[PDB]
Amino acid sequence: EVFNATRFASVYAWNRKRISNCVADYSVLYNSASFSTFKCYGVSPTKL
Amino acid sequence: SEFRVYSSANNCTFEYVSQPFLKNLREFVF
Ligand SMILES: *[C@@H]1O[C@H](CO)[C@@H](O)[C@H](O)[C@H]1NC(C)=O
């Protein structure tokens, strides 16, 4: 519901969506080849 | 038959769903 949206907002008024009470599987999005760049700061993307 | 008191909720942070609670005596402890 976040990555697939009909229309994205302009950068002057960015959206701030709250995600809570759920299990976040980041392997599907990380393995997905559809992203052009995936830059993580702080911790490496595979231990999340 | 209509809704009340929980109007104009600026933003809400939690929702959970369970099966329903309620000659029958009903005791609860909070
Ligand atoms: C709603 O937004 C305010 C920002 O003014 C924030 O303080 C609050 O934690 C948010 N959530 C709820 C349930 O009010």
UniProtKB/Swiss-Prot annotation, chain A:
Changing S32F: In strain: Omicron/BA.2, Omicron/BA.2.12.1, Omicron/BA.2.75, Omicron/BA.4, Omicron/BA.5, Omicron/BQ.1.1, Omicron/XBB.1.5, Omicron/EG.5.1. Glycans are attached at N4. Binds to host ACE2. RBD also interacts with the N-linked glycan on 'Asn-90' of ACE2. Cleavage of S generates a polybasic C-terminal sequence on S1 that binds to host Neuropilin-1 (NRP1) and Neuropilin-2 (NRP2) receptors. Interacts with host integrin alpha-5/beta-1 (ITGA5:ITGB1) and with ACE2 in complex with integrin alpha-5/beta-1 (ITGA5:ITGB1). May interact via cytoplasmic c-terminus with M protein. May interact (via N-terminus) with host bilirubin and biliverdin, thereby preventing antibody binding to the SARS-CoV-2 spike NTD via an allosteric mechanism. The chain holds residues 340 to 387 of 1273 of the full protein. It comes from Severe acute respiratory syndrome coronavirus 2 (2019-nCoV). This is Spike protein S1. Attaches the virion to the cell membrane by interacting with host receptor, initiating the infection. The major receptor is host ACE2. When S2/S2' has been cleaved, binding to the receptor triggers direct fusion at the cell membrane. When S2/S2' has not been cleaved, binding to the receptor results in internalization of the virus by endocytosis using host TFRC and GRM2 and leading to fusion of the virion membrane with the host endosomal membrane. Alternatively, may use NRP1/NRP2 and integrin as entry receptors. Changing L29I: In strain: Omicron/XBB.1.5, Omicron/EG.5.1. It comes from the Viruses. Changing N4Q: Reduced viral infectivity. Changing S36F: In strain: Omicron/BA.1, Omicron/BA.2, Omicron/BA.2.12.1, Omicron/BA.2.75, Omicron/BA.4, Omicron/BA.5, Omicron/BQ.1.1, Omicron/XBB.1.5, Omicron/EG.5.1.
